[PDB]
Structure formats: structure tokens, C-alpha cells
């Protein structure tokens, strides 16, 4: 019936203590990572980073990023579900150090503008009933001098781990009386001036949905 | 429950009369298409795909690429409905015209001829996006996207033949061709590659019910 020998590839969801992700074996990185932030989550007893980055043995070795892929690349191991979101448990924080939760990030971005966006996201748990965060890579085309449009991204290491051109982050913010808002950001995988205000990187959710292949607003509007 | 507001992206399988496929909404193209070759329309956009992520005829028009069907129309003469389903653009990738009409057409005809010889013939076809090293020493994936909807142009295509011989023995024959004007006098056997190289590059693991493959 064509399934006799099984199908050649299906969605790879991974549920960890601190997040759920969907994994793309072609790029060797997550398609998206989903977290729920709340205030009890952000205060410690996790907050030992005595965790090291670890390859994800639940991913077939053909399609698995390793620490050796990153070494000498010039890229940081940039965690999509952030370690500091998950001080509420050591297991929760350790799970953020799986390389399936990680993408090659320009070090300036990882340390400054993206870190600021992560801190801002946590600060909103003081305001909203619930804060959900969906984070992931983008591979965005550009028009080159021949007039044609191309996607171009570096791959690093023997395992050809894809370097995203950009990153997105979608915030779902729950306030009282059933209010639901969506705020969504894109930054380039590049040094980003840390003194640029974060709301300059707001984009409409439709542009992220079109570019990423994902759908956000139908699921949320369904409640 | 983390997944309160659903999940932003799932596997997208589509069953048709003539094939099963898995659809990648980021590239706006199939990840793989699976069909059975048995001895015994115009192109339409696929309304089962969200419009944000759906290739259209306008995406191909004036692009210089042919609408290359992954499951080939000539595989599914056994039914009007089966052949019609090959003209959904979800079954289609941008193909260099010369490739579509000559060497990849010959590969498709050759695959059909194996139904003479084997008890069953299944075929898994799809795109590849293969990196290359540039003058700066670094390796890049680079591919054209065409149309308003940015339909990805594969750098290569793969075809895996799953050949069922006597005794239930399964033989795997794996081919890759560049998305380029391939010299059609080159014997098809020159495009054979080890299936592991396709699995590594594509993210796919073929025939996973075969826990221990032939030899
Ligand atoms: Mg981080
Ligand atoms: Mg056709």
C-alpha cells in the first residue's frame, strides 16, 4: 500500500522538561522550540550552569549536530530555549544544553541583542498571566545582482549543520479576561547594535509564517 | 501543557491515488514522494496546502524552469484519477528543462522497465539541497527561489528504487542527478550513489521496516 516498508521520514517532535521542539534532520537543527515562561520558573535552584553542551542521542547520527561541528566555526552554540528561562529545576536547565536546542549564532548576537530579547521576554512574566515563547531559525532569500532570488546559508562541520540567516521569536501573552496577544520579532544572524530598541525588530506574524512554513494564528484563534 | 495553543508545524503527509508524499512548507515543495510502479491534465495548485506555503503556476511562469513531476504521469496510466493527481504542484519541483525532458525522463522510463524483472517496484523520489565549498574555504547551501511564493529550486534530485526480488529479497538502487542539463548519453549507472550518502544529505531514512538490509 506503499507503507509496506515504512515511510522515509516523518515529523520529529522532542518533549524535554523545559520545552518541546520539532527537529529538522536536513538542516540538523530545530524548526521551532516552544516554552511557557512563568515567574516561579525563572528563580533558581537550577541556576548552576555546571551543564555542558551535549549532542542529542535521540537524533540519528547521520543528522545530529555535535560539539565538533561548532569547534573552530566562529559561531556560538546559541540555545533557542534559553538556559536562564529554566532555573526552576536542574533537569530543566540541563535539557537546554542538548544541541538539538542549539543553532550557530554570531557571538555578538548571542551575547547582546538576542540576550536582551530573552531578558525582555522573561520580564513580561511580571505583567501577564502567561508568557509562551516560540523561537526558531529562518533561512531568508535575497535578490542577488543577476536579478534572481536565492537562499544561501553556511553549513559548518562534517555534519553540515546549517547556519540560520535570521532568527524569529513569537511571544504569546495572556492577560486577564481572556486577552491574548502575539508579539513577534526577527533579527539577522549578524552583529546587531545593542543600542537599537527591541521594538524595531517587530514584524507582523504573517511574514514569519510565510517565511518559516509555520502557522501560528489559526491555532491560537481556535483557542 | 506547553502545547496549549497547538503546535506551529507538523508533518504534512498527503495521500493521493498514485502516490504518498511529505510536503515541506518552507521550500514549498515535497520532501519525498513514494509510489509503486505496476506493469498494468494541466498543473493545478494544491488547495490542501495553506496559501502562504503553496506553489502556483505563476511561480513557474517565466522562471526558465519546467514543472517537473516527482511521481511521473507516465507511471500512472492505469487510471485517469491516478494520472490527474500527478499534476498537483505539490508533486512538482522546478527542473532545468533539458533535465526534465532527457536524462531524468530516461531514468523514469528505465524504472518502469524494471517491472519486467522484479516482483514489485517501488520508487521514492525527491529534492536535494547540497552544499558546495566556495572560494573563501567555507561551505554553503545555495539555491534559487522562484516566484512571489519563493518556490525552492533543488540543486539535485534523488531517486531510490526499492526492488523486490525472489524470496522477499529487497534491492535498493539509488540515483542522484544535478538539476542541470545532464548529458543523456551518459549511462544511467554512472549516477548511482550509495544510499547512505542520500540518507545523510536528505535527512531521510528509507525503508525503515527493513531493520537489517540486504548485504
Ligand atoms: Mg540562549
Ligand atoms: Mg508531468
Swiss-Prot record, chain B:
One Gene Ontology term, aspect cellular component: mitochondrion
Keyword annotations from UniProtKB, A to Z: Disulfide bond, Endonuclease, Hydrolase, Magnesium, Metal-binding, Mitochondrion, Nuclease, Phosphoprotein, Transit peptide
Residue runs in coiled coils: none
Compartments where located: Mitochondrion
E.C. number: 3.1.30.-
UniProt keyword Nuclease present: yes
Modified residues (Phosphothreonine): 56
Cofactor(s) in the UniProt record: Mg(2+)
A GO biological process held by the record: positive regulation of apoptotic process
Main function: Endonuclease that preferentially catalyzes the cleavage of double-stranded 5-hydroxymethylcytosine (5hmC)-modified DNA. The 5hmC-modified nucleotide does not increase the binding affinity, but instead increases the efficiency of cutting and specifies the site of cleavage for the modified DNAs. Shows significantly higher affinity for four-stranded Holliday junction over duplex and single-stranded DNAs. Promotes conservative recombination when the DNA is 5hmC-modified.
Assembly and binders: Homodimer; disulfide-linked. Homodimerization is essential for its activity. Interacts with YWHAG.
Family: Belongs to the DNA/RNA non-specific endonuclease family.
Protein name (Swiss-Prot/TrEMBL): Endonuclease G, mitochondrial
Organism of provenance: Mus musculus (Mouse)
Complete-protein stretch covered: 60 to 284 of 294
